[PDB]
């Protein structure tokens, strides 16, 4: 049975993030509305200690974050250098919110290490852009990195797969010099698009050369092509790297209807990627991430919880607290937008062939 990281206090904390208000409550409430919590093991998240956070993040950064958090000082002169600002405002309590999420992802990882489950879920995690000494991209603390480091206590090789719209740069950079963690990110890569890194030529550094895989994708990609790409890369990665555990970031900012309006995916296409990873039958840590159409993010992660459970869910959205957010259709399915796929078969083939060549080196 999957572990579901959840408490009422946790969700309420996660609801207060500035760029996704109420999202955690919408997600949890939809999953509950589908009765899926009755098929999972609910685990209260432990808050991350300063020591656990400092295995990745600098004390100076954490100390500054905790400082501005006390009263929500969004005007502190040092904040710019620590990445706090427009994307990452210093909201009152943000240190507590970020320690809670870090703690939730560590807890999930610990359940995995203890053999409590094969699948552990923290839909409020996946804040993949944070650097050791810098907030970035709505991320204040890199819970993914913290979860990966925790898994490294037991599991010899960790694969991180990042299906968020944006390049998982914080996680890649944290592990760019090691061969013990392989990072794989599929993302939009176009000059001017955040965070501006992760071209197919970025493969990591030193001993970690070839242990970073980047798949730059253009606007308008749909389920079928995305899965073809993902399966092709993951097939090769799996043979080459032989992971003992997986951390999977499933940001829903790829899904049609997202205000970012870049990719054109549905939850079913992402679910095929998820299904492919789950059949490896490795310890798997599931994270959320982006997702700025709040109802669609809940539709996505609810459907994906369903595929983790091997259930097909009713197409009718059940009555619940946020029912009205699901109009005008009130169904779980998401229809792709009618706009061009900007991905040319030839460019995709060059990218995949380049990646295949890089992975030949991974011994």
């Amino acid at each position: 049975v999957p572990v579901y990281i959840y408490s009422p206090e946790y969700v309420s904390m996660c609801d207060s993030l500035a760029k996704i208000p109420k999202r955690a409550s919408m997600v949890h409430s939809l999953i509950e509305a589908y009765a899926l919590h009755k098929q999972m093991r609910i685990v209260k998240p432990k808050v991350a200690s300063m020591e656990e956070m400092a295995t990745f993040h600098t004390d100076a950064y954490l100390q500054h974050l905790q400082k501005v958090s006390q009263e929500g000082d969004d005007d502190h002169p040092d904040s710019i250098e620590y990445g706090l600002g427009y994307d990452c405002p210093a909201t009152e309590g943000i240190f507590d919110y970020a320690a809670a999420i870090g703690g939730a992802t560590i807890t999930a990882a610990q359940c995995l290490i203890d053999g409590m489950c094969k699948v552990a879920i923290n839909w409020s995690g996946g804040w993949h852009h944070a650097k050791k000494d810098e907030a970035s991209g709505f991320c204040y603390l890199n819970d993914a990195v913290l979860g990966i480091l925790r898994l490294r206590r037991k599991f010899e090789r960790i694969l991180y797969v990042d299906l968020d719209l944006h390049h998982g740069d914080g996680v890649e950079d944290a592990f760019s010099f090691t061969s013990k963690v392989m990072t794989v990110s599929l993302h939009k890569f176009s000059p001017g698009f955040f965070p501006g890194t992760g071209d197919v030529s970025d493969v990591g550094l030193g001993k970690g050369r070839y242990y970073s895989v980047n798949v730059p994708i253009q606007d308008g990609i749909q389920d079928e092509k995305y899965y073809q790409i993902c399966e092709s890369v993951l097939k090769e990665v799996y043979q080459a790297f032989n992971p003992k555990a997986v951390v999977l970031q499933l940001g829903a900012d790829t899904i049609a209807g997202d205000p970012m309006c870049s990719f054109n995916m549905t939850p079913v296409g992402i679910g095929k990627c998820l299904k492919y990873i789950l059949q490896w039958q490795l310890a798997t840590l599931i994270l959320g991430g982006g997702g700025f159409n709040l109802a669609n993010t809940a539709r996505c992660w609810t459907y994906l919880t369903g595929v983790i459970l091997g259930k097909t869910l009713s197409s009718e959205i059940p009555d619940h607290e946020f029912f009205t957010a699901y109009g005008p259709d009130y169904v779980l399915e998401i229809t792709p937008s009618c706009r061009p796929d900007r991905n040319e078969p030839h460019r995709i083939q060059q990218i995949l062939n380049y990646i295949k060549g890089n992975l030949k080196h991974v011994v």
Binding site: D87, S136, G192, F193, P195
Partner: peptide, 5 residues
């Protein structure tokens, strides 16, 4: 540095 957002 880029904006996100």
């Amino acid at each position: 540095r880029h904006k996100k957002x």
